[PDB]
Amino acid sequence: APPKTTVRWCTISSAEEKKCNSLKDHMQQERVTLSCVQKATYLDCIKAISNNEADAISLDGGQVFEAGLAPYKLKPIAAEVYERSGGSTTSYYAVAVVKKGTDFMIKDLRGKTSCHTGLGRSAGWNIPIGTLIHREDIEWEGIESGISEQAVAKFFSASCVPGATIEQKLCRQCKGDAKTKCLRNGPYSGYSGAFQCLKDGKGDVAFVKHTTVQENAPEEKDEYELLCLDGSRQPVDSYKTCNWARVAAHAVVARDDSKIDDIWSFLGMQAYSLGVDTTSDFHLFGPPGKKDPVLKDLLFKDSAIMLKRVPELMDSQLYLGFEYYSAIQSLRKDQLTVGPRENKIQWCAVGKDEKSKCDRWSVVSNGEVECTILDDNKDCIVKITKGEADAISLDGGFVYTAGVCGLVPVVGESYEDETQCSKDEEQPAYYFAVAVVKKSSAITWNNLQGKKSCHTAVGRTAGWNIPMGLIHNKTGSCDFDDYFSEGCAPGSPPNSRLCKLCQGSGENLLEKCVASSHEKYYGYTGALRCLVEQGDVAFIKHSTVGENVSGSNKDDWAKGLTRDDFELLCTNGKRAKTMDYKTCHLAKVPTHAVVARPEKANKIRELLEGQEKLFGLHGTEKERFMMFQSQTKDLLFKALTKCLVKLRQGITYKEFLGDEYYASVASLNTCNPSDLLQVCTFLEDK
Ligand SMILES: [Fe+3]
Ligand SMILES: [Fe+3]
Secondary structure, eight states: OOOOOEEEEEESSTTHHHHHHHHSSTTSSSSSEEEEEEOSSHHHHHHHHHTTTOOBEEEOHHHHHHHTSTTOOOEEEEEEEOOSSSOOOSEEEEEEEEETTOOOOGGGOTTOEEEESOTTOIIIIIHHHHHHHHHSSSOOOOOSSOOOSOOHHHHSSEEEOTTOOSOSTTTTTOOSOSSSTTSSSSTTOHHHHHHHHHHHTSOSEEEEETTHHHHHOSSSGGGEEEEOTTSOEEETTOOSSSOSEEEEOOEEEEOSSSOHHHHHHHHHHHHHHSSSSOSSSOOSSOOOSOOOGGGSSSSSOTTOOEEEEOOTTOOHHHHHOSHHHHHHHHHHSSOOOSOSSTTSEEEEEEHHHHHHHHHHHHHHHTSSEEEEEESSSHHHHHHHHTTSOOBEEEOHHHHHHHHTTTOEEEEEEESOSSSSSSSSOSSOOOEEEEEEEOSOSOOOGGGOTTOOOBBSOTTOIIIIIHHHHHHHHHHOOSOGGGTSSSOBOTTSOTTSGGGSSOOOSSSSSSOTTOSSTTSTTOHHHHHHHHHHHTOSOEEEETTSHHHHSSSSOOSTTTSSOOGGGOEEEOTTSOEEETTOOSSSOSEEEOOOEEEEOTTTTTTTTTHHHHHHHHHSTTOSSTTTOOTTOOSSSSBSBOTTOOEEEEOOTTOOHHHHHOHHHHHHHHHHTTSOOOHHHHHHHHHTTO
16 A cells, blocks of 8 residues: 655664664665654653654553553554464563572562563563562552552562662662663663573573573573472473463554554565565564674564564454453552452443343343443454453354454354253254245346345345355355345445445434444344345345244334245255245354353353343243343344253354354455454464
């Protein structure tokens, strides 16, 4: 994506400002050219980037955190990649390195001396200080107006903690001048300096990363060891079973509101040219048998092997994870101490009709269920990943996109009241993907190209995945929009051909193609209405038809209706009667399931057995409120849900979906993963 612009890099040391000037000499000869600015701190760099003075910096996990907060909301545009044998990674392990032969365990660290990478840094500060507090060791039980975070000064006798401008005990083991021993860029900073601090005997432990012995002493690795959390010691190479955490790689932050394309163009180019095996001398990442610590980790960490572009949906919150974001938070802000599950579950509700239905559930339940609101499914999957909402019942297609994201199926929606439900329950039986047509017996399966189709929504089992999975296999073109003549598939780009037949809120202005019941044509019932009113095709499930037809839907569009007005389209070319599913469907597909973070999932499940005993379809207070009946159409739960089938503990979204449906939504998504699917693909790594 084209400029011919300068990118203003922000360096926070003069060593690093020399590797940056050597790099803009290495391609003054490109569309995208570099410029270098030097600031004392990365925090002078952050607001340098807030104001439009600078354009990039590769910040630690810890300082990507603070760059992502207001009044500058910089986001991660690329990440460092790292391994040896197995592949590449987007993360690293914080370790606590000790000398072989000293004899302290983790219990015994008090009145010891520590070498730190820096103040506010992951492996160096956040991981190990945060872990000491949590265990009991560092005694800090907040800043209400409690004096505080440098209470490590009390724990450690003296330390070397670069950036500390509060404590003196913390500046104490640092080599260098007087003014400059305790600077960020000072001699005992980074992984490599904190390692040297320990080599020297200026600390008893160094709070470093998993490659720090090997980049600094590959030669004398047998002389060092790791300090495990279980009150044992493990060898240098046993860090997979002896680390303190796994944090998000350092990553390049840049204004959201700007030129993230030129920075990635420069970076993409640079790396391709001056990468790991360059064809001679400028190396952007190059780290052998120890150099001088101040020479290490300039621009990018020496252990970085590539720079991986970060999907546009990612923020810092999402970038760091739920655990690490919240661990920063713990120590970084207030004592947040007796509210981990705040015993109300937050339901995620898509748009205003489900909100009102939810709100009623809250009332009625006596606030056992509480409610969150969002405009999309997509947006609701983000809140859950982020701990801002806890659960949502989703179509199987969204189950796939959610499981990719780390969320797990809790209860499967069963559409037999009847079959599978307790003792009764086996596995939520599967429904069927179907193609519905009207009167005209011209239209066939094999004649749809050019038709005027209708879809439940984009990325919905029945409404999109089966239909488009199937068409796409035929054609082998990622052209979806340009197959049908015009259509409705809410959540489609507004410009699309597939945003053409949507009618939004009534038609009454509001919102012509959103994926919510704010859109006229959203859901299974929404796209039958499209058939009836505009559509040529309706991609729906097997009972839609027989749910709204012969006096079942009492809407005016549906008023006249009968199942005689509809037929099904077979894949063989032929047609059939709606009341014939087993013999003429698009495919047999898994049900709708409620998903949650895996930690949350066993008290969601009892919440729901609780609520179902009361508001389910043989509920005790079902006169007060029936959970599975909607005042519009499907709202929270599909409207003819009979019960919620319990998934056994630790079931993955793949096992839930099965291999057929797993393989069709994988294969379809080889073409145009949505932004939430791209954030979550990235993050399977974390
Ligand atoms: Fe780091
Ligand atoms: Fe569905």
